[PDB]
Amino acid sequence: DVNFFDELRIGLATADDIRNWSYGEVKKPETINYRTLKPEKDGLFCEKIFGPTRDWECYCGKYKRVRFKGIICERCGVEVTRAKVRRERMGHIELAAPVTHIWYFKGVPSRLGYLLDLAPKDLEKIIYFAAYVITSVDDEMRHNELSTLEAEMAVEKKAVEDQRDADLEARAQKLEADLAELEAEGAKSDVRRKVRDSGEREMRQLRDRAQRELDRLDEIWNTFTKLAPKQLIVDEVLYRELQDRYGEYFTGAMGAESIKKLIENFDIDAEAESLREVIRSGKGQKKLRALKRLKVVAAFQQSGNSPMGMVLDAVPVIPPELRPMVQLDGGRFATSDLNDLYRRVINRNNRLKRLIDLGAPEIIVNNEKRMLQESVDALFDNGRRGRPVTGPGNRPLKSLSDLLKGKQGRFRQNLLGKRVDYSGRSVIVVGPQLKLHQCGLPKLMALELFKPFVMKRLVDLNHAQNIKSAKRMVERQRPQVWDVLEEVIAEHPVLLNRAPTLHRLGIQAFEPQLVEGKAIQLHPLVCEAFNADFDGDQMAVHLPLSAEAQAEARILMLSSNNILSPASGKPLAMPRLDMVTGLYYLTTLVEGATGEYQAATKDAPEQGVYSSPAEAIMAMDRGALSVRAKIKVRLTELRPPTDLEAQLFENGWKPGDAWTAETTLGRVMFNELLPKSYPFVNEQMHKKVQARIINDLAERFPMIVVAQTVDKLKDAGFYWATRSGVTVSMADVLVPPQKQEILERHEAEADAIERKYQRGALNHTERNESLVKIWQDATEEVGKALEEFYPADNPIITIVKSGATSFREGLTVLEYFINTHGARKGLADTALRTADSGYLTRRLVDVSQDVIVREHDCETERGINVTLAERGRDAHVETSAFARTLATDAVDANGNVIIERGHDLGDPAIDALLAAGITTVKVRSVLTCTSATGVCAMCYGRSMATGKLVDIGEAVGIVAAQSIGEPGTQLTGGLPRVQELFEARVPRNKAPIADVAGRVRLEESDKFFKITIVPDDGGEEVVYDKLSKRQRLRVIGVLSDGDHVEVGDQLMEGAADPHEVLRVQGPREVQIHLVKEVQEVYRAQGVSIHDKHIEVIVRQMLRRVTIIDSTERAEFEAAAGRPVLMGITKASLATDSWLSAASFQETTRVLTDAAINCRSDKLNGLKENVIIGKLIPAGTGISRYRNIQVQPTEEARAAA
Ligand SMILES: [Zn+2]
Ligand SMILES: [Zn+2]
């Protein structure tokens, strides 16, 4: 129980291993006495083997006190020790007949079948007693006696011929007499042919019966001469006759013991060398059939596992506590299915001993071994072969396989996902008055959550005298604890989470504030992250305990420290909904306002000017100044625009200096919210403006400044959202009466046009275009009739303009029916959007979880170019160029270098680059990182969450998977296309790529399109004859006849085979393609994902190569292999960790292949450490971080 083990290894458990594990053989299929209800002896639950029921108490009771431990009672045979051993100790069952392990027999491909060259359909007939197998053969005796055996065989065969020919002549000669009697008697011409037909056919019968015996004889002899071990004799009768004679020359048997023998005399090395034949043709599958099988044969040779392990002589019995039998509440009993499966095994096994001792016939005995064989199969993997064993109600019993795996089973999530103490949940309610780092916690919830803490505090304080006195003091909720509760809660962070958890921001830390009520008060800014509606949504609370946990919450998972989306870098805590309209109304400029500014007239000065913002406030309180007026005022503690100030100053930005600009009091009150160092804005604030502003100020200020600035915007937005006058009513919605009238107007144009179409004015496409012109003219006419009819400041329009976000006439009966037909498809289609996105996100995580930053820099010059603008700004520079690092300097044509290599490439850098007009830039990428382990900080680049360089410990693979899986809910060219890419499957509709460079010859044929490429070598022409016209052409105009094509261009519309572009353009260009297509899907849905996230996933596909002649890349540096592209699922299953891969998909094959290979897991990944409870090798788990030493400086200790 050290908690730090290096490796974890498997292997075939031999009969001895099982016997060594067990604490005694369970001999009876009994559980507990129906009266005493105590465990029966020698049976399941037997305390004499598994363990005592009570601590330090034997079965009889002659030893009861803890005084004696480690001894065994000489009466009941029970060891006096803790009752827990009942959960650690196993038993075993000695089988009267060997049995095959179903995992190596029925497990496809048959591990045993591949190990002995027995087809699974043939092997199934052997171990289940459906055919005999030749175990041994005496070659010398069969050869020395072949002469006499052949003679005796020919003689016996001849005696059959002499009988046959003698019989036919007796039938034909007798038929001649019967027919001769017909001439003397009345001759019926019909009967004459009827008798002959009867006689002739009878001869054929007599002659064919003889032939069949001859063939049976020939069959007997041929099989005996060619008789070789591993041959199967399914004929039984043949086998018996093959045993009556020649029985002393060979041997044969059925069942697992026969398979046990074939494995006995089996030279593993000899069978391998004959399989080492890389010659003997091999281009055909015949060698692959040996190639595929050689893996299973070599695995046993390279390891020490004896292949005998595939046949069990003893079966281990799982401890009772894992298969418990307890009496349910209400008097009823409950017990696991394993007990009924073990019972079937131990019953049939015992009956076999009985039959063996009774000298029963082999039909009965063999029938028992077959029954025993099936009982062990059911015990291990019930249902894997034949119908599963079902109990009352016809439900399949849960075997050990099912118990191991399952979605809710102990393999996938029952082991990974477990319930935790110090937790709780409740419905959430808005907490508009909360600080971003705070959360409303119901007093009762915070009480029970911190119960141990408050118990100690109110005991330290002489309120309660002992612990027990403190417990009741909290349970009864005596009013004296509350004051103690706010202390224990102070500066003690708690974790909030809302299911489902999509990204890491779905869990954040908060300062707990005791709040009246039973609900949880959530800050209104984190809703975006949690995606938390306030329509009854619930959230969970977890209480970090250890000092490390609290440190991780305060530092890593603090709410205020996580503002930017770790997927796009954009801000999530940005104001939204009311806060937007509130600020939109606050800063909007209304012409002709109440206190509007007026230029000095002939006899009066300017009346819109005000001394300070305070004066404007006083003027606002009176009916003088409107918040949205165009007044001009002087400012002393605010910052003027960068461009305007330079004129007014240059000596320095105003710290207390005065300056006058014309704005609105709102815009003044707004800028007061921003930092004092931030220049003035003077604009009506939209989501984007506030989004544009929050970003800009997030780069130039620490997040604490951004955290407080977003909080201040929340208050203002909410405050002015109320004074905004935004309310809905009939006059706000209603209907533009011109619409219904004008709609009936244009409808007449479409009906009479059809009238004109029928007569002869159709003119083909004239109708389709005309009807479209009318429909779009009316559709465009209603927009104006509605947009111009709605006031500019209409509440519906205001909400739309700010960016926070027709049944008005009513529908008749039939109209509403049609609407339901489509509305129900959206709800059902939405059900499939969430399932697959979570199934994709799991595979994504399954393949990239072990990817973490391991070093600051790998120092590789390799990089990837970026298109970066094309106007002569690109539309997607924010996803691929932003937050990158330059592998090479940015050189201008004029010789001036701007932005040096290894720079952060901030948006100001993008503009500085755009200033010099540089189209492309080479950039570091995880696709090119040469890090031996994971990736490096520089290659990865800026962390989207922190805005700075990525920290060394960051586990970017998981963040990438979440960044990709989360938006999967918004996929419609959607989720299937994405899985098509990440899984590396050939495209749904394949598309060709240019295999070389040169011109193109477009040929038009009704059957198919033909694209020939004339190389510029010029060498052999490349023909792409097979082409479906339904696939269209690729766009540049369209690819026409005679155009030039490059080495990687796509010829027709569709998806190019990634495996195709791999061998053509190489690995690096494949990864650029996959990221290109993947990002294009999400971009189609308006989803902003930084390329690096996709790149992290793509990096893991090209990490291995195929070995054509004697896998990862690092092994080759210390025998030719080609770069390989493979899907995430296949790649994940190829991980070095076997229990990690076992938890992923199909645990049986991984477990069987792992046990045979005898693999050892070094616990390198983080999934493994999660299962066993070790510190994951990421974040605070890295060695460099967890081995830090904290010693106070000698100078500080002096101060004391
Ligand atoms: Zn005893
Ligand atoms: Zn690197």
UniProtKB/Swiss-Prot annotation:
User: Which positions does UniProt annotate for Zn(2+) 1 binding?
Assistant: 58, 60, 73, 76
Q: What is its EC number?
A: 2.7.7.6
Where is Mg(2+) annotated to bind? 533, 535, 537
Q: Which CDD domains match?
A: RNAP_beta'_C (cd02655), RNAP_beta'_N (cd01609)
Top-rank EC class of the record's enzyme: transferase
Cofactor(s) the protein requires to work: Mg(2+); Zn(2+)
GO process terms (BP): DNA-templated transcription
In the record's cofactor note, how is the cofactor described as bound?
A: Binds 1 Mg(2+) ion per subunit.
Residue positions annotated to bind Zn(2+) 2 are: 858, 929, 936, 939
Subunit info here reads: The RNAP catalytic core consists of 2 alpha, 1 beta, 1 beta' and 1 omega subunit. When a sigma factor is associated with the core the holoenzyme is formed, which can initiate transcription.
Q: What family is this?
A: Belongs to the RNA polymerase beta' chain family.
Q: What is this protein called?
A: DNA-directed RNA polymerase subunit beta'
Species name: Mycolicibacterium smegmatis (strain ATCC 700084 / mc(2)155) (Mycobacterium smegmatis)
